[PDB]
RNA sequence: AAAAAAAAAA
RNA sequence: AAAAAAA
């Protein structure tokens, strides 16, 4: 089990999943 | 030599913990801050019971805590922190009595009690800051099960109500959700999930985190971001000579200049989640850059689009 | 020969603000309407306390409000409105006593109190409409931090509970969400974020927004939409000779690759026309065109 | 011709 | 910086 989220930070845009991008 | 907050935190930790308090270990400082936060919140055994509007279950829990024996001198705190026999004196002296309010003491007019209340507030603030930093540092290499979607991660860290009361701008959790959802007044502070917090070994000394300080990758990443932030922030670090474990800080990101790019549906049109990404269907959101202020000047680094927790473990293999 | 609804607001504003009330400035009218709404909701200093089921913190807040000195003649409300000595008399005689219900007054049969309650209701409705329009006008150049996702923007405007109670079909906020995200009755009104609200200077005189009446771009955009609506609506306005920040309305939207091809309908003087959507928020478009 | 009124009304 | 102030 693990997670691939990347929350928005420092003006970036949030990602629901790293792999799908 | 030091501000009032740092001096009072140093005095409290020293008095409570004797010489066992190591001033150059992040984990030790985090454990000491957690213990002092428990002490000043009457969450330890043998302290006053919070029963003002407590439910019968809350009443029973607090009463059981009160009846339970308080920690005995010499008890092991965390790993390398041992209580002294003179911690009870400090707990009885410098801890405001349960229900104490600043207005009442100001009406009383006793300067000593005003100073003690200000010291209590400052100690709560410092301990909460250290707790938040240790929360991020833990999140770097230990995911929190409570987080499964961007909405859940939006309120990180998840801390108690006292933490939110002391430092609203740094502490998330249920109370942060409650404050954000409700009306936002002038006193409301937005949850800055990635606001810069110097590591505990810097915060107590007051040495503001800056370029050139020798820090470990994990502690720096916790200072500037947390586990689920982008991996590009790893570019703010650079190993020193001989690899080792301690490197140096090369940049400090900036989290300003943020605006809205949504277009709600209206007059028969369809809602758009983002005007920029719309374009002609090109959903390639990897050109975004983070602004890093280096010694030479400000630069922009292209986002990697991967979690810090993932990258830290991957690159170590 | 204005309707009783607007006549009540005109008389109330006159009585409460003397000659300092200007009948041609949007900001002045919006501030006056906000003050009258606060006065008629028993939220000023020195007014009755809301203690039916208040919490301890709310109890203290209401008690402090009641004990606090009430506004005095000569106070400055906003920027160009000055309270007069007659405002106390109006507040005493025309504001229904806290907790007054229309049913009780109607049953009592007192014509004077029935008329007073009807005037109070009309004033509440007009003040809420002006408040919604001012919220839309403000949102064009300064968004709310709460609006960070489409779901959050779905509930604009974010006004107080009494505002929703007076005008359910125009006010969003938390209470609108609760009404939608919960049991719905027959007397249920659906939020219309783009309902055409004439500018206050046109609203308090009974004028209906139409084609051929001079207005400002921000005025029209607030009238027919808000900050995060698409920018194509800006095509409903046309600047006049020399600009000068004053133009004219040429149409009003209806129904108030392919995705960017969607068109809005504009009712022009000749006939309905289809205008391609721009895909950029009115706030963003105005920011870009500012310079 | 949805718009306006009267009944209701954290 | 200061002053307010619990699931």
Numbering used by the authors:
A (entry chain E): 291 to 311
B (entry chain D): 34 to 350
C (entry chain C): 34 to 289, 316 to 350
Please share text taken word for word from the publication where this structure appeared.
The viral nucleoprotein (NP), a key component of the replication machinery, packages the viral genome into protective ribonucleoprotein particles. Although TiLV-NP is considerably smaller than its influenza counterpart and unrelated in sequence, it maintains the same topology and domain organisation. In addition, an oligomerisation loop inserts into a hydrophobic pocket in the neighbouring NP, the flexible hinges of which allow variable orientation of adjacent NPs.
The pseudo-C2 and pseudo-C5 oligomers appeared the most stable with uniform density according to local resolution, while the pseudo-C4 and pseudo-C6 structures displayed poorer density for 2 and 3 NPs, respectively. To account for this variability, symmetry expansion, particle subtraction, 3D classification without alignments, and local refinements were applied during cryo-EM image processing (see ‘Materials and methods’). Finally, 3D classification without alignments were performed to isolate the most homogeneous subset of particles, itself subjected to a final local refinement, resulting in four final maps enclosing 2 TiLV-NPs for each RNA-bound TiLV-NP oligomers (pseudo-C2/-C4/-C5/-C6).
